[PDB]
């Protein structure tokens, strides 16, 4: 049976998830939680999911962005966001760190806050150390939209959602997505 995505207000999404014991990573148990994430992500569809969003209070994230999803976005926005496809990534106990003080500002949404968007400022360059799905120690250097999803998913594990880190006056229904920003809202884009 496939778990449901958990909505905002459920305390599992607002409290800090706990680390997987690295000796446990390859058990049928953590493997099932992982496979469940992957399936819930591909069903939605979305580019990223964290374990708290399926009710599991653990430090686990998955992410994928496919050529197919990407060929839906305006070709010029794909270019501003630096949005490039990348194979399915699983990380257990991810620890995120920026590689520089450069930030970008664009719209994100979250499966836990259904129907809405807001502009959120992200580090453009990250590193995430952690474990892959076989208990092996990995590091991942990420920029552009990939680094965005890493930060979004990582945020979940500390009980942080984007509605609590969005630029004022940008929150909006999906349908209002393309409406103009109000005066004194910063422009979407990035640093030189
Ligand atoms: Zn989310």
UniProtKB/Swiss-Prot annotation:
It comes from the Eukaryota. One of its GO terms (biological process) is translation. Zn(2+) binds at residues 110, 152, 156. Inhibited by actinonin. Keywords: Chloroplast, Hydrolase, Metal-binding, Mitochondrion, Plastid, Protein biosynthesis, Transit peptide, Zinc. Its main location: plastid. It is found in: Plastid, Chloroplast stroma; Mitochondrion. It catalyses: N-terminal N-formyl-L-methionyl-[peptide] + H2O = N-terminal L-methionyl-[peptide] + formate. Its EC number is 3.5.1.88. It is an enzyme of class 3 (hydrolase). Substrate binds at residues 45-48, 109. The active site is at residue 153. Expressed in roots, leaves, flowers and siliques. GO terms for molecular function: metal ion binding; peptide deformylase activity. Residues 113-118, 158-176 are annotated as: Dimerization. One of its GO terms (cellular component) is chloroplast. Binds 1 Zn(2+) ion per subunit. Disruption phenotype: No visible phenotype. Its cofactor is Zn(2+). Homodimer. Removes the formyl group from the N-terminal Met of newly synthesized proteins. Belongs to the polypeptide deformylase family. This is Peptide deformylase 1A, chloroplastic/mitochondrial. It comes from Arabidopsis thaliana (Mouse-ear cress). The chain holds residues 79 to 267 of 269 of the full protein.
